[PDB]
Amino acid sequence: SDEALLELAEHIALRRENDVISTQVAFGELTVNATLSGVIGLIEFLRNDPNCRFSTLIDITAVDNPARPARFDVVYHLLSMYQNQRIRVKVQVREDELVPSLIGVFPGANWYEREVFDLFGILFSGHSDLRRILTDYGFRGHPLRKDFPTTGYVEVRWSDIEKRVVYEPVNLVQEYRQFDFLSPWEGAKYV
Amino acid sequence: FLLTTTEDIINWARNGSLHWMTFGLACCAVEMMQTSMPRYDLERFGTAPRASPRQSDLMIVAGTLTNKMAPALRKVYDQMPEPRYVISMGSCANGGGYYHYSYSVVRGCDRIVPVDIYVPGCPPTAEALLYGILQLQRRIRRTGTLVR
Amino acid sequence: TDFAQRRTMMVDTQVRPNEVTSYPVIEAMLNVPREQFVPESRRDVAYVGNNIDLAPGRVLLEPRTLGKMMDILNLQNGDLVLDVGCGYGYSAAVMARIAEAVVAVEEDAAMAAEAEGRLAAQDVFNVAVVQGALAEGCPGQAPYDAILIEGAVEQVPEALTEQLREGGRIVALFREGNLGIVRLGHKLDGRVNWRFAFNAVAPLLPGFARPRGFVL
Amino acid sequence: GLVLLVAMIGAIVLTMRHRKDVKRQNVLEQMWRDPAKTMELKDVKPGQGL
Amino acid sequence: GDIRKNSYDDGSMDALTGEQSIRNFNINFGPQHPAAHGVLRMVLELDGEIVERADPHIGLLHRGTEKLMESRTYLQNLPYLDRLDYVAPMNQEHAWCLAIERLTGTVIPRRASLIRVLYSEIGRILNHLMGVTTGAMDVGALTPPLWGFEAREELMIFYERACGARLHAAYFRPGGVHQDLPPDLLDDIEEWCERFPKLVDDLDTLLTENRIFKQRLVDIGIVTEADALDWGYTGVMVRGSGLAWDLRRSQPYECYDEFDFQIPVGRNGDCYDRYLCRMAEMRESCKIMQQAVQKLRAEPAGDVLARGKLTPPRRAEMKRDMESLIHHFKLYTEGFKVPAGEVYAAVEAPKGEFGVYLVADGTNKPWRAKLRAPGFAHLQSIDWMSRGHMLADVPAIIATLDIVFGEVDR
Ligand code: SF4
Ligand SMILES: [Ca+2]
C-alpha cells in the first residue's frame, strides 16, 4: 500500500499540477497539500476520477498554528469504498480569508463547515446556511483557537431577580491547573 | 395527633407515587435506564416515568448540563407543578465533572435548579441511583409537609 | 447567488427559533435584502450568523441580535423610531417596514452617503438619514417612541435618552468586559429604567465608552 | 339511499385531490416484505471493498 | 427536493399557497421529548402532520472535549473517548489507542489483541441491543426494551469484572489492555453466549413478522447507494442498502482476519432492512465472542501491555526494580512522547466508522485531536430523509440512524 499510495500521488500531481503543492506518504497515509484556489476543483477530481474514486467525504476539520503566517489548516478526509483507499487534503488558510464551500460536491460538507466556522472562525463562501452549530446562541469567540482560554470568559447562572438564566463573568472556585511535565531531554535517534 | 399523621399520609402517598420526568442528558441516562429495567425495576416502587413535566414530581438531572441546554432544563423544571424534587445524578450534574473547566458547561446543575439529593459516580451504578432515590424518600419523610 | 433562499434560511434558523414571535418582524426580515446593505466585499457572507464588519469598530449586527432586538421593542404602525448608528441602513430598512418613520443617525459620512443611496435603491421612503455624532442622536425630530442603538455601549448619555417620549422604549447592548447584555429601557416619570433582555456581544461604539481613570 | 349516494358522489367530485409530493407506502406490500429475501449474509474476504 | 408549496395530482393551486409563507406550523421536537434522546432540539415544519422541513439544533451536549484534550497528556485523554458514544465505550477507546500506536510504531501483545476483539464485539451487542429495542419503543412496542436491557445488564457486568466499571471502562490502553481477564470471567462469557441467540429469537418472534412493526418500518427512510455517498454514510447505514462494506474486512485491524463472521446487507435500504441487519450483526458478534474466548484459552500466558517506554510496569516490578519505579513515575506524570505527525485511525464502531484525527508534535500532549463521529454525518441527513414523511415516522427515522449525542456534539 506504500507503493500504491506513492503511485496514486503521482497520478494526482500529474493530472492536477496547478492544484497540488506537494504530496507526502507518512505512517501509511497519503496527504496532498493543495492551493486554496484549486481545492474544490481537486476534490471534485478525486471524487470522480476512475483511478481515485473518493466518493465518501469522511470529514472536514481545521488545525490552528498561531506561529505560522497562514495560521489555519483546513483538512479534508476522503474515503473510497470502491478503490478501498483513503486520502487527506490540506490547504493553508489565513485569518479572515474565505474558504470556498464544498457543499456543491458533498451535501454532507454543510455541517462540517459550520463546525469549522463555529470553533475556528473561518468563513466559507458559497454556504447556504452558515451559522454556529455547537456553541450557545450568541457565543463570543472561537474556542478551538489556541489563544482562546479553555474555560472561556463567561458562565451561566439562574438569576432569581431576572427569573432567567443569565451570563456572568467566569469565577472559578479552584483555578485551572496546567502542569508542565515535559522533560528537558529529547533522547537519541539511533541509526 | 392530626396534623403530623396527616403529613405522614401525604408523605406516604408522595413517596409511593414518585413520578419522574423522562429527561436524560448523557451517559448518566444509560444507568438511569438500567434502573428501570428488569434487574432493578424502579417502577415496582411506584416510581414511574412521565413524559410531561405537568405530570412529574421528580426531575433526575442525569448528565452534563451545557450552557446552551441550561435554559431548557430550567423551563421544564418551572413547568413542574409543586411539589417538585430534583436529584443530581453523576459528576457532571453534581459539579461539572470531567468537563468542569470547559467553556460550554454548567459547573453543577445547582446553579440552575435547587437540588435535593446528589448521587456520586461517573456514572453512578443503577443501584447507586436507586439508593439515591430512597434517600430522597427518607428526606421527604423527615421533612415533608403539604407544601413539599 | 440565490440570496432569497439564504434570506429565508436565515429567518427560519436564526430568527424564528430565538424567541422572535412578532410576525411583523419576521415579515420584514424575510423581505429586506441583507446583501444590498453590506459592503460589496461582504456580499457573499451577508447571511452568516455573525456580526459583519462595516468600518473599524462598527458592525452590522448578527441576525439573531437584530431579530430579538426588534421583537422586544414592539414597534407600532404609528411609531417614530431613532436608529443610532445605522451603518449602511439594513436595520433602518427593516424597521421602516413596521414603524411609521425612522430617523437613521450615522457618524461616518462615507456610510451615511451609502445608506442614502442603498435606501433609495430599495424604494424606502420613510427613512431619513441624518449625519452627525452617534452619542448626540437627532434632537431636531425628537421625541421618539423607540430608540435602537446598533452597537455596544458602556453608558447611554442623558442627551440621547431625553429624546425619548414618555412611555418610549430604548434597547441597547451593554458591554461589561467580555460580557454583553442587551437591555430594554422604559421611560417612566422622566427616568429610563433598564431591564435584562438577553445576552449578545458587539464591539463598542465610538462615543459611548465610560469615564475610566486611575483607581487605587 | 339515493339522497345519500348523491352526497357521496358530490363530495368526492367536488373536493378529492391527493398530494403527489409526499412519501406513500402500500400497506399490503409492507406486509409482504419477506425478511429472508430482503437481508442476506455476505462472505467478505479480508482487504475487499465494494 | 422542496415540498413546502404543496403539489397536488389535480394541479390545483390554493389561494393561500400563493401568499408568502409567514405563519408556518413550527414545533420544537425535543430536547425534553421521549424520542429526542434528551438533547436534540429538532425544529419541525409540519403541514397536516407531513414533515416539510426538519432543522436539527445540536450542541446541547457540546462540552468542548476537543479543547479539553489539548491540555492533557495522552493517557489523561483516554477516558474522554469513553464518553463520546457512551453506549459502547471501549469501542471508542480503540481508535485513540490505534492512533497512538501507529504514530509511536508500537506492537501490542497477542492476548491484548484478542481481548480487544472480544470486548469490541461485546460493545457492538451492547449498542445493537440498545438501538434495536429502543427503536422498537419509538414505534410503540413497550416490551422489547425490557428484554433487551436485561441482556445489556449482563454484558455491563462483564465490563465491570474486567475493569471495575460498568460503563466507562478506561480499559483499552495505548499498548494493549490494562489488566488480564480472570479465568472464571471467560467461563461466564461463554455461558452467556450460549443463551443469547434465544433472546434474539424471542425479539424476532415478537417484532420481525408483526404486521404493525412492518407497517412502521418497511419503505420508511429509503436510502440508495447515491444517497449514501451524499451524506458520508458508514456502517449499517450503507450495509442496509446492499453495500458489503465493513472496516473489519475492507481495512482490517487487530486480528479480525482470523475470525469467521459474515456481513449482513439489505436489499431495499429502508428502516426494516437496517433493523434486520442489526439483528443479524448481533448474532455474528456473539459468534466472534465465542471464537475469541476459545483463542484466549488456547493462548500461552503473556502480558497484556507492551511495557517498554509506552506503558507503566507491573506493580510488583515497580516496587522492586529501580528502572521500573522510574518508568512508573515518569509514565504516570509526563507520559510517553508521541513523534510529530498526523494520522487518522478508524474502527468499525457499533454506530459506523469512528475515527480519531490526531496531530502530534513530539511532546506528551496532542496538538489537535479531531473526533469523527458517525452520528454527526447520519443526523445531518435527517432533513433529506424525513422530508415527505409523516410526524409519526420521525421517531422511527431517528432510531434507524442510531444517534448518541455524546459523539454528535463532543
Ligand atoms: S457524570 Fe460521567 S457517566 Fe454521568 S453524564 Fe457525566 S461523564 Fe457521563
Ligand atoms: Ca405546504
In angstroms, rounded to a whole number, what is the distance separating the alpha carbons of residues A90 and A81? 21
Q: Which residues' Cβ are closer than 6 Å to ligand 1? A: B 26-28, 63-64, 90-92, 97-98, 122-123; E 83
The distance of Cα C212 from the centroid of its chain, to the nearest Å, equals 26
Helix (H, G, I), strand (E, B) or coil at C92: helix
| Distance of CA A123 from the midpoint of ligand 2 (Å) | 33
**Nearest Cα residue to B101 out of E241, E20, E370, E68:** E68
Please tell me what resolution, in angstroms, this structure has: 2.3
Please tell me the distance in Å from E408's CA to the nearest CA on chain C.
19
Residue pointed to by grid coordinates 436510502: E223
In angstroms, rounded to a whole number, what is the distance separating the alpha carbons of residues C179 and E161? 49
> CB within 8 A of C113, min separation 6: which ones?
none
In angstroms, rounded to a whole number, what is the distance separating the alpha carbons of residues E392 and E22? 25
C69, C104, C150, E13, E190 from C134: Cα distances, Å: 18, 10, 10, 50, 78
Structure solved via:
cryo-EM
Helix (H, G, I), strand (E, B) or coil at A71: coil
Buried b (16+ CB within 10 A) or exposed e, B63-92: bbbbbbbbbbbbebbeebeeebbbbbbbbb
**Nearest Cα residue to E91 out of E291, E345, E378, E376:** E345
Contact of C40 with chain A, judged by CB distance below 8 Å, is answered with no
What cell was used for C160? 440621547
DSSP B22: -
Of all residues in chain A, the one with the smallest CA distance to B95 is A173
In angstroms, rounded to a whole number, what is the distance separating the alpha carbons of residues B121 and B30? 13
| Distance of CA B90 from the midpoint of ligand 1 (Å) | 6
In angstroms, rounded to a whole number, what is the distance separating the alpha carbons of residues B117 and B108? 13
Residues E1/E381, Cβ–Cβ less than 8 Å: no
| Virtual torsion, Cα A92, A98, A102, A107, nearest 10 deg | 130
CB contact under 8 A, A154 and C179: yes
Buried b (16+ CB within 10 A) or exposed e, E270-304: bbbbbbbbbbbbbbbbbbbbbbbbebbeeeeeebb
- Please provide the size of chain C in residues: 216
Helix (H, G, I), strand (E, B) or coil at B62: strand
Render A63-94 in DSSP notation, one character per residue. Answer: EE-TTSSS-EEEEEEEEETTTTEEEEEEEEE-
Chain breaks in chain D (C to N over 2.5 A) after: none
CB contact under 8 A, D38 and E266: yes
Q: Which long-range contacts (CB under 8 A, 24 or more apart) does A163-172 make?
A: A164/B71, A164/C196, A165/B70, A165/B71, A165/B74, A165/B112, A166/C181, A166/C196, A166/C199, A167/C179, A167/C181, A167/C199, A168/C179, A169/C176, A169/C177, A169/C178, A169/C179, A172/B101
> CB within 8 A of B81, min separation 6: which ones?
B54
Residues C203/C53, Cβ–Cβ less than 8 Å: no
Of B74, B104, B107, the CB nearest to A136: B104
What cell was used for E393? 415516522
In angstroms, rounded to a whole number, what is the distance separating the alpha carbons of residues E146 and B34? 9
Residues C145/C123, Cβ–Cβ less than 8 Å: no
**Nearest Cα residue to B24 out of E84, E68, E60, A156:** E60
What phi-psi label fits residue E109: left (phi over 0), alpha (psi between -120 and 50 degrees) or beta? beta
**Nearest Cα residue to A40 out of A124, A97, A105, A113:** A105
**Nearest Cα residue to E231 out of E409, E388, E382, E37:** E382
Q: Is the peptide bond before C143 cis (omega within 30 degrees of 0)?
A: yes
Which partners does chain C have (≥3 C-beta pairs < 8 Å)?
A: A, E
**For residue A115, which residues of chain B lie inside 8 Å, CB to CB?**
none
Residue pointed to by grid coordinates 443479524: E280
CB contact under 8 A, B38 and E80: no
In angstroms, rounded to a whole number, what is the distance separating the alpha carbons of residues A161 and A179? 40
Contact of E166 with chain B, judged by CB distance below 8 Å, is answered with yes
Ligand 1 atom closest to residue B27's alpha carbon, by position in its atom list: 8
CA atoms within 13 A on the CB side of A65: 16
Amino acid type, B92: C
Residues E196/E323, Cβ–Cβ less than 8 Å: no
Of all residues in chain D, the one with the smallest CA distance to E215 is D30
CA atoms within 13 A on the CB side of C64: 22
The answer for B 109-148 residues in CB contact with A (under 8 A) is: 111-113
Residues B88/B135, Cβ–Cβ less than 8 Å: no
CB contact under 8 A, E57 and C27: no
Ligand nearest to the CA of E85: 1
Amino acid type, B15: N
Of A123, A129, A154, the CB nearest to C178: A154
Of E66, E232, E341, the CB nearest to A57: E232
Residues E322/E313, Cβ–Cβ less than 8 Å: no
Q: What are phi and psi of E254, to 5 degrees?
A: 55, -130
Please tell me the distance in Å from E83's CA to the nearest CA on chain D.
31
In angstroms, rounded to a whole number, what is the distance separating the alpha carbons of residues C146 and C164? 7
In angstroms, rounded to a whole number, what is the distance separating the alpha carbons of residues A88 and A1? 15
Residue pointed to by grid coordinates 496527504: A31
Ligand 1 atom closest to residue E86's alpha carbon, by position in its atom list: 8
| Virtual torsion, Cα E65, E234, A27, A75, nearest 10 deg | -60
Residue B122 among known ligand-binding residues? yes
DSSP C29: H
What cell was used for A41? 476543483
Amino acid type, E263: I
Helix-strand-coil split of chain B, %, nearest 5: 45, 15, 40
Please tell me the distance in Å from D9's CA to the nearest CA on chain E.
17
List of E strands, chain D: 39-42
In angstroms, rounded to a whole number, what is the distance separating the alpha carbons of residues E129 and E146? 10
Pairing, β A124-125 against β D39-42? unpaired
**For residue B24, which residues of chain E lie inside 8 Å, CB to CB?**
37-38
The distance of Cα E260 from the centroid of its chain, to the nearest Å, equals 22
> CB within 8 A of E371, min separation 6: which ones?
E65, E66, E81, E84, E354, E355, E356, E357, E407, E410
Of A117, A127, A137, the CB nearest to C64: A137
In angstroms, rounded to a whole number, what is the distance separating the alpha carbons of residues C141 and C84? 13
In angstroms, rounded to a whole number, what is the distance separating the alpha carbons of residues E404 and A172? 30
Amino acid type, A42: L
Ligand nearest to the CA of E61: 1
What cell was used for B71? 435554559
How many contacts, defined by CB atoms under 8 Å, are there between A and C?
59
Residue pointed to by grid coordinates 424564528: C16
Helix (H, G, I), strand (E, B) or coil at A24: strand
Roughly how many angstroms between the first and final C-alpha of chain A, as a whole number?
Answer: 25
List of E strands, B9-113: 20-21, 49-50, 58-62, 85-89
In angstroms, rounded to a whole number, what is the distance separating the alpha carbons of residues C101 and C95? 8
